[PDB]
Design a protein around this ligand. Structure first.
Ligand code: SHX
Ligand code: CO
Ligand code: CO
Ligand code: CO
Ligand code: K
Length: 304
């Protein structure tokens, strides 16, 4: 395998981290290949769940807890800290909140969160690599509590970063927020990609095509599929009670991705940097509720 940039995996990985048995587990947690039978039963269906009041309360809770866990990771971002060390702290923070870390054993994914440095678009596997001054790193968190999953991510700066990194991260965040601002009942899911690509393109960046936002509730990933690029064929119209993510991945160079031999790490084919931000959203009569928002601070971590 020819690596596309400077990043390499840093092995060995620590043995899988156990989750105490008192924490409620999703179906895939104990499947030998980490398959989710509840999800697979709906594979190829485009119908979107309308959440009940109980569902909404469940989503508010797990999304708030997921935010707390992302904030834990954010506080650890500094030169010399390994992504494995971030993952260990995330794992413990989930357990402390009586939550299962959703990525863990999801289709045999080996860790409790995804850490995506520089040219890694998404699904980076926490490993022994110390973060370096100038790096950008995304941490993508998902928690499972009482049958519900809550999902968010932010890109962080490691020490002082260059102008390109600042512009990339800022633009990606703006892309997410412009998309969120358009969410309300009656809007087609396919419209969000038009909004995101317009803003990315205006700043000389490209939009990843192979990975999309998704419905999330009792399932980790389900209908609708939410592409982030323009003129896509996403099926569905937003209705009050829909819960889904928007999670644009934006690139300095071209949009093309490839996967490392580990089967997970998605990287830019040109080795240039990529950034991502993500919220879980509930559609309401007036627009949407950002379930994974900060409650105590106005801005994402890269601005604070
Ligand atoms: C956004 C997303 N992420 C994952 C993933 C898997 C492991 C850890 C973190 N995230 N999986 C997703 N979908 C998978 C399929 C998949 C797997 C790997 C990359 C893309 C899609 C599914 N529905 O079973 C999807 Cl749609
Ligand atoms: Co994912
Ligand atoms: Co996520
Ligand atoms: Co997501
Ligand atoms: K990245």
């Amino acid at each position: 395998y020819r690596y596309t940039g400077k990043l390499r995996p840093h092995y060995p990985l620590m043995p899988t981290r156990p989750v105490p048995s008192y924490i409620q587990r999703p179906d895939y947690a104990d499947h030998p290949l980490g398959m989710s039978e509840s999800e697979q039963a709906l594979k190829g269906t485009s119908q979107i769940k309308l959440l009940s009041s109980e569902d909404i309360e469940g989503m508010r809770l797990v999304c708030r807890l997921a935010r707390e866990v992302l904030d834990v990771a954010a506080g650890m971002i500094k030169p010399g800290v390994t992504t494995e060390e971030i993952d260990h702290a995330v794992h413990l923070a989930c357990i402390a909140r009586n939550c299962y870390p959703s990525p863990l054993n999801y289709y045999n994914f080996p860790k409790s969160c995804c850490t995506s440095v520089n040219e890694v678009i998404c699904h980076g596997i926490p490993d022994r690599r110390p973060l370096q001054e100038g790096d950008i790193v995304n941490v993508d968190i998902t928690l499972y509590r009482n049958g519900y999953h809550g999902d968010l991510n932010e890109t962080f700066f490691v020490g002082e970063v260059d102008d390109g990194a600042r512009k990339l991260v800022q633009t990606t965040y703006e892309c997410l927020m412009q998309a969120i601002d358009a969410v309300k009942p009656g809007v087609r899911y396919r419209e969000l990609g038009n909004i995101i690509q317009k803003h990315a393109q205006a700043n000389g960046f490209s939009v990843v095509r192979s990975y999309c936002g998704h419905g999330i509730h009792k399932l980790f990933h389900t209908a609708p599929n939410v592409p982030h690029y323009a003129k896509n064929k996403a099926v569905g119209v937003m209705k009050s009670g829909h819960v889904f993510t928007i999670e644009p991945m934006i690139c300095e160079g071209g949009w093309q991705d490839e996967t490392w031999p580990d089967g997970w790490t998605a990287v830019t084919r040109d080795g240039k940097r990529s950034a991502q931000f993500e919220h879980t959203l509930l559609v309401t009569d007036t627009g949407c509720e950002i379930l994974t928002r900060r409650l105590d601070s106005a801005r994402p971590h890269f601005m604070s």
